[PDB]
Point group: C3
Chain length 96, copies 3
């Protein structure tokens, strides 16, 4: 997926590059700035993506909990409303 540590570290290094860029604008600093940004973007995208997939599992887990609740005689008046929310919520997480 993605390593948050490396991303955050790289971000601070990106800041360092920016400061050097602004102090002395140059083609070198521009390219190096872009490089660091692109490398960060790779981790940025994956960490966003992986979270969504994880969220889908969380929502699916919640659905399993709803079953567990119903199993031991929880009023459907409560559960059914969560079922509506969980269904639509999951939909908003999945892609295809």
């Amino acid at each position: 997926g993605s390593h948050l540590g490396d991303l955050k570290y790289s971000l601070e290094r990106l800041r360092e590059i920016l400061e050097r860029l602004e102090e002395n604008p140059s083609e070198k600093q521009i390219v190096e700035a872009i490089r660091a940004i692109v490398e960060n973007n790779a981790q940025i995208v994956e960490a966003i993506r992986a979270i969504v997939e994880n969220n889908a599992q969380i929502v699916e887990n919640n659905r399993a909990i709803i079953e567990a609740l119903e199993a031991i005689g929880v009023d459907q008046k409560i559960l059914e409303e969560m079922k509506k929310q969980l269904k639509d919520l999951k939909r908003s997480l999945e892609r295809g």
Copy 2:
């Protein structure tokens, strides 16, 4: 919200641009690199944002579960501690 597929695809294309930039630095490649980054950033931000809103729903769903649990006589000793966590957790997700 955001389309993870298009973002990831665009990311790989951004990498392609970077490689071309480094091999032959130019104003063209710099601008095109920035363009792709900015377009990615649009999806990056929204996918981050949308997740937080979705998380708020998940936490709210958990609160509904707590009610369902209490309804059928779960010891408050357990539920009350989750209520504390869910309250603060939700707070950290909301903005305004």
Copy 3:
């Protein structure tokens, strides 16, 4: 953590810079574009990171719910499977 409002706002401003860059490419617009991107990246990373930590709390909360469910005599046949999922899910959220 991160302020979604400021990030989204800054994103739209970044777009504005891009449009100016493309219309009239220049060292100034390039540096300013990078600056805005880097500043966004700071918020982008943190909002990604903070979510993962929040997700860990959500999964931990789900584990607490499992206990609450078991407390009042939910069939382990259901709970144990969630325990397996929650354990691995948490693992995928934590870093170190």
